[PDB]
Design a protein around this ligand. Structure first.
Ligand SMILES: [Zn+2]
Ligand SMILES: [Zn+2]
Ligand SMILES: [Zn+2]
Ligand SMILES: [Zn+2]
Lengths: 351, 351
């Protein structure tokens, strides 16, 4: 009857099942009954890399949540009974930076600032919730649990592609085609680009070959120079621009960043999507010679969640080949498998 | 009677005076009688760093030219007798990249692609010439020779400031306040920013204090952290934004680039204006945390030369405190003095 969460008591300690009572809600809170929560590099950071959470321990992680609003504060009652995706990052929506949001000084994330989605239920602010059309979901052969990874995994690269002005005629180049990079490929394709997938993993390439990558390049097989000349071949074959390439570093490695920076051409955009604390060695002045720009992406404004979901509902992109469902009570095994890079798809924990 | 040039026969060889005959011009060429040619880091690169020129030696350097059109091909005759600034870089204006220019694959520069302005006369294409209102020049206590440095030295940072969307309420921060950086300060001020001048040279700061720098910070005296906190003081004093700072790296050093990258704040723009082949160590992912962008500037579209000159004519910026006039036949002494960093202003060689 009572809900439960699986919490981190300490980084690397076994996750502990903990019942909790909802009680009275504040005016602008809802309870979502969790269908699914994605397992993210950000969660593994808290657990394995002991990254500080803003909420004190113990804390349930998980910030990629779909489910149903089953209880609501008086101001949020219009959410009752509706299928939703919770935004991974909720800007204050009231500060001058939100008025004019991704960097909002008062932005809040589940599984960091408040109790997360590795739970039967999660209490979240109602601001920025994305409704799911349940008819359209069912048609597409998708569970409500499946669209959990629209939060962050789809929306982060959606924001990055939109911000880079990816348009028909363009070559899009994405480095690191697991997780976020996989969706950068699918979305750049949907936006009208001819996409080049670059990864060290042949299986990832094979997969992206079937879902929007017009070209694949194994970065193990091929140094900086062959990389460029292979993409120009692709461009000239299909009558595509040889300038103004839209490059997305999605691996979040120094190796990927060196490799992406290496592929700058005249008027190109380099989108920095993958987070790492690693420093690279680059000559900043390459940006000058190419009259190029480097655009830093942080997450995704909630306002874009409906459009990203729309891509999924309409089969313009595919989630199903990129997700795998596990029991929430196997969170330990899944965390351990994701950390050892044993997972070939994004894990969704399901109560 | 015959014109003459001072040519580089070989990098580091004494410059040699060489008479030449103009002869018949092609349809779209003019002869400018040189009033003045600026002495640029780019010239010193050819001479001291043996950077390859596209024209074979011997070659007269100099690409920052003002003077009078005294002869013209039939298609260019409307230029005859007019005071001009020659663009430092002339895009083809006919390629699809110019149609839609700074990076144009067919772009031409005096003192690199064709004979330069260290000469009594220079034969240039008429495309992109900037007329000078001689009445307005005289009023402002300026020689026609003086506006030679509008080419590159003023226009390069004009392009960079325009491209960064520098607007009232903004804090502009320019690192390296000699030459191009000095004009980035003056132009950001004219555009409505409150400008912070950062340099290692106290005399440069003193100077910029008098010409658009609302604040000066000696980068010798003060590490990364005090730098930020001093600028926030300035911002809060005058009611200015603490985000979306417009940062211009104008020194073209790794030291300056590290220092500028270090000053990224939320929504900031980092303009890369100074060229160097030096590589820096930075975490590219700072661009993400700040939702920031890095914009590479190459030169300036000829179309902006009238607006930049307009700033000079109208006293909105000042050239006079930033120039020093020398005889063209002292090119050797001036090259040697600029290379040893003995010059406190931009040298203009005058026939
Ligand atoms: Zn995530
Ligand atoms: Zn806000
Ligand atoms: Zn120059
Ligand atoms: Zn062109």
């Amino acid at each position: 009857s009572n809900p439960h969460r699986w919490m981190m008591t300490s980084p690397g300690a076994p996750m502990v099942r903990a019942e909790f009572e909802i009680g009275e809600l504040s005016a602008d809170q809802v309870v979502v009954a969790v269908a699914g929560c994605g397992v993210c590099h950000t969660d593994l950071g808290y657990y394995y890399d002991s990254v500080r959470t803003n909420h004190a321990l113990p804390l349930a992680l998980g910030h990629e949540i779909s489910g149903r609003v089953v209880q609501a504060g008086a101001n949020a009652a219009q959410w009752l009974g509706r299928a939703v995706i919770v935004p991974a990052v909720m800007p204050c929506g009231t500060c001058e930076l939100c008025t004019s949001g991704t960097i909002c000084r008062d932005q809040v994330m589940p599984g960091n600032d408040i109790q997360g989605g590795f739970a039967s239920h999660v209490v979240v602010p109602a601001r920025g919730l994305c409704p799911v059309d349940e008819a359209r979901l069912a048609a597409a052969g998708l569970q409500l649990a499946d669209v959990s990874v629209v939060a962050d995994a789809v929306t982060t690269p959606y924001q990055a592609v939109l911000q880079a002005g990816v348009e028909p005629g363009d070559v899009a180049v994405v480095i690191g085609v697991g997780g976020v990079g996989g969706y950068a490929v699918q979305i750049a394709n949907a936006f009208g680009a001819s996409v080049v997938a670059i990864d060290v993993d042949p299986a990832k390439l094979e997969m992206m070959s079937k879902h929007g990558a017009a070209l694949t390049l194994n970065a193990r097989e091929i140094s900086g120079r062959d990389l460029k000349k292979a993409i120009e071949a692709h461009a000239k074959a299909n009558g595509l621009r040889l300038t103004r390439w839209k490059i997305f570093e999605c691996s979040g490695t120094g190796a990927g960043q060196t490799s992406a920076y290496g592929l700058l051409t005249h008027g190109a955009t380099l989108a920095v999507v993958g987070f790492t604390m690693d420093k690279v060695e680059v000559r900043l002045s390459n940006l000058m010679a190419f009259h190029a720009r480097a655009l830093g992406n942080w997450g995704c404004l909630p306002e874009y969640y409906p459009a990203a979901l729309d891509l999924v509902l309409d089969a313009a992109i595919d989630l199903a080949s990129f997700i795998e469902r596990h029991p929430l009570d196997q969170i330990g095994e899944v965390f351990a498998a994701a950390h050892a890079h044993k997972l070939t798809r994004r894990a969704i924990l399901t109560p």
